Symmetry: D2
Subunit: 277 residues, 4 copies
């Protein structure tokens, strides 16, 4: 009985979903953490059967639960009155990082797989030089610190030899004009933090953590990235969300017990190239 919490899904079109699908093959029970502002929409679509085709594995994806989850709030203490008043949030509760860990632990006990699959930058459209302090720190808060806080709070509800992964992108290491707003900065911090966290979690809890540097998925510039990737990557096949999924599944399993602190590239090998051929 393995249970994985996936923080950061909004539809079946991203990595979170591809990871849920592949894990389901291993009979892993899935819990979704969903950004409150799209939680109700997601529940509706799910109810209206919009995801039924997406859920087929002759095996059904076993979704144990779907919970509102906001990566920018650590505890009930951090909720500002403007979101308290806020339309969407008003009718939802217990969606802070610590609140969700308590809920899950209470309802289902300890888990052993954790997926951080979320990024947000309010100024992702502006290049770095034109990003505001507010926009930059928002990017870091939502995309980088959220990983640390996730680990801080979920470690108490995880079994020993548990495993954790996040998703990153090569803009951290090499220049991708157009990946702005401090998203590149956020990814660089996330990959560094993955190492620092791997040391602490490894020594203190025997828990592993790694990150997957993924190629482009259509989930503007994304159309460029995907086209360029499919033209110039070593491997011609289309990169599927389940290509990341099967890698994630392996990193979350005990088959990878000796791998931690790593950035693992799942991008058809595009990262290895220097000049177009």
């Amino acid at each position: 009985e393995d249970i994985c919490f996936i923080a950061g899904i909004g539809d079946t079109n991203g990595y979170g979903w591809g990871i849920a699908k592949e894990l389901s093959k291993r009979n892993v029970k899935i819990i979704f953490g969903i950004w409150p502002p799209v939680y109700n929409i997601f529940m509706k679509n799910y109810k209206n059967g919009k995801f039924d085709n997406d859920m087929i594995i002759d095996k059904k994806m076993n979704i144990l639960d779907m919970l509102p989850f906001d990566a920018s709030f650590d505890t009930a203490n951090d909720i500002d009155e403007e979101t308290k008043n806020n339309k969407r949030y008003n009718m939802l509760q217990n969606y802070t990082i610590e609140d969700v860990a308590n809920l899950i632990h209470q309802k289902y006990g300890k888990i052993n797989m954790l997926v951080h699959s979320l990024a947000n930058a309010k100024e992702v459209q502006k290049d770095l030089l034109n990003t505001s302090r507010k926009g930059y720190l928002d990017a870091l808060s939502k995309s980088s610190y959220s990983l640390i806080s996730l680990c801080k709070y979920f470690v108490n509800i995880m079994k020993p030899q548990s495993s954790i992964i996040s998703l990153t992108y090569h803009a951290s290491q090499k220049v991708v004009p157009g990946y702005g707003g401090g998203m590149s900065s956020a990814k660089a911090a996330l990959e560094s933090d993955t190492r620092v966290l791997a040391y602490h979690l490894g020594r203190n809890y025997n828990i592993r953590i790694n990150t997957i540097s993924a190629g482009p998925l259509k989930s503007t510039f994304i159309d460029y990235a995907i086209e360029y990737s499919e033209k110039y990557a070593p491997l011609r096949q289309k990169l599927l969300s389940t290509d990341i999924g099967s890698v994630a599944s392996f990193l979350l399993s005990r088959e990878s017990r000796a791998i931690t602190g790593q950035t693992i590239y799942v991008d058809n090998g595009l990262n290895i190239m220097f000049l177009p051929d």
Copy 2:
């Protein structure tokens, strides 16, 4: 007539000073940017001649000016009332990043060298896993975004083929337990941002930017780092603030016109080692 603004000095015991000294050999005019809370102390010591020995180059260090400078505020607009009221700040003015660029430009015209030499993390003593969101973002704000904002505002007051450097540390790339509070995260972001900035500044202004990854200088754990470095680094000599200074001088000169976006290690080669010998 070359002029360099050095943001982030508080005494003659750090890299900023070593960089000022070496630049002075090249007859570069120096302007110091000093954290307001220690500005007056610094001025006093300077007046009381405490730095006279430190200033000798048979050449005097030519300090063109010394200005209060706070890396956490971008413009006059960002000054919160608590600092406005604040003792130290109350008797100082025009210390925001944009304010200082305007002052310098007004008093002295355009400059062609910029040094970012500052780091601060309010929770540097806590390890990453135990760092608060507030502490983490403060680290990023002061140590990383400050570089971007410095470039944003000083580029308008710099000549073409100007040059910029900052200071970083290898904890960004490899684990150094004890370098906490998100300082490691901040350095990783700074090294990544150095590349992104190098592209923008290079293409749009023909300005270069690089960062120096420095070994330990006594400016607790620092005593460990220095001892370990002196035991295990390829080069036995003591690492001097002027070892960083002479490298900085070269990176800021036109002798390095074809180098940009780089992290340059000035650490007696310690970075190259895996296991102690």
Copy 3:
């Protein structure tokens, strides 16, 4: 699913651990064995020495294999006539490719699990040209050539792995003879190969940077491995003992279709030691 494992000489190394793990997924294993140790390995197999170690493997075949030789024409007269090669046939790279293809058809998995350097005991500065080139020939070029001849007997979408060590990237004094150089070249060649193999053949290639394991080869170095192992178990983020099957299950994953979007990569399987700068 058939895998050729090039470079196994006993049950104490990574090759055996890889064999073991691939067997679990019902992969057919073919051993390529260096002729100097070929006979003794055979003898121990039939005399059931490895029986405790195979806990049961599916060993399709065991062939003489020397990665120094690309084709039969490359075998020098002395080696040809040597006591231990006497006496043996079809052990070059081209020859084992052909032989394997005749017996079994096309395969889909390849493991390069070998390395050799005559002067490993010398530090780099003191290595001769001859010793250095030997290291690169046996440890690095052998991979390139293995690929060249096996790509024709491999299907799409097959997978190739090799084994490397972090001394290529960071200084490990005592890892001498140009072995550091050979691992650096091999990690670079893995990228270049991943490009050509991916484009032209839809074949994948990656390399595993393993942590210390007390193997035959590891002892060839003048207690270095004992210190290595002991240091890793003390300072690695993960303090479990590193097993050859830890690498093996990672090898199995890389060779399987589950890793179809990974290529050209150096993957560290070393309890995380590589991420550390300063000892604790």
Copy 4:
């Protein structure tokens, strides 16, 4: 201040640009010249061809030098008797070391500015063992051996540099013959050497990863350099044209005492091209 420059054959490469820049700081330059091009280089010197290019250099000496040979005993009979070596003496590595020491005493600067690969035109997968080993011997081992023999005729706190190319780290199709492999090994060897040289000799060693320059060697590759240059001038963060003196002033800095705390490093002098992932 005396610098030996190993690997100059005309005024169109990095060696010349390095010579030029070192002259500016009043450094005494000794050229080591490959015997195949030794005579013509001499002839052009006295016939004032390079006069426009030396705008005045301080050329202390010009010696025959072949980095394929470690000692006189390494010279094969054919080479020994060849039309172009006929006729020449003391051109091995040990021999030039000794010769330079006798004429001038100890030096404090060394530049490895050479590379060679018989099969550069072939892609890696199609390179023979012989071609690959040639690339590593001439381009990589030559540095190690240069160090071995020159450390005895160098003072503390002397400095050594070599030249490399980013194809070691990222795939550049067309950079064949094992040249990519040779650059990867050389960048690794630079670290290992920096350790031994720093500890035992207080001598520094670094390598410069240069951008494209239309040199003799660069054209040996089957328009590749023209595309390289054109691509760099279009996509590099800095759009100025990359000059051999751009590398030269960086070489001068690395060789001088101003860089006393830098060692084991790969320093990119390439208008920043290396930092880019996606074309504009």
